[PDB]
Every structure is written in C-alpha cells, then in structure tokens.
Amino acid sequence: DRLMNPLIDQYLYYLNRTQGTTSGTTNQSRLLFSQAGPQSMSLQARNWLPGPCYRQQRLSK
C-alpha cells in the first residue's frame, strides 16, 4: 500500500462523500468525488493485492 509517490497526487478520482455536504439547510445527500493525494494515502487507486489467507486463532504467550 506504500508503493506510490509521497509528493505527487494521482490523476484518478474516487468517491469519498455520499451525503455529508455543506450540512445545514436542505442538504440531505450529494455525490462527491476527490482526487487522490498523499493525504488520501489509504484511499488511492491500487494495482496489486495481498496474498491469500486462511484465518488462524490468536494465542498469547
């Protein structure tokens, strides 16, 4: 997940707001998109996934 560039922003867009608008008067919902930045680090577009899995139970020493 930490493979991209910390300095430059992506030119791709993702949706991050479904309702929360200028919430006060007549603001129920609105579709809002953001351009990925170093700030939206765990939200940026991705090219790869992690390896497979088979959950194990957690034990303490």
**4 near a copy of itself, judged by CB under 8 A:** no
Select from 4, 9, 40, 43 the one that contacts a copy of itself (CB under 8 A).
9
The DSSP line for 37-53 is -SSSTTTS--S------
Say which residues have a Cβ less than 8 Å from residue 61's Cβ, sequence separation at least 6: none
Residues numbered 31 to 60 that lie near a copy of itself (CB under 8 A) are 45-49, 51
Say which residues have a Cβ less than 8 Å from residue 6's Cβ, sequence separation at least 6: 38
Least distance between a copy of itself and beta carbon 32 (Å): 20
Give me the residues that bind a copy of itself (CB under 8 A), please. Answer: 3, 7-9, 11-12, 45-49, 51
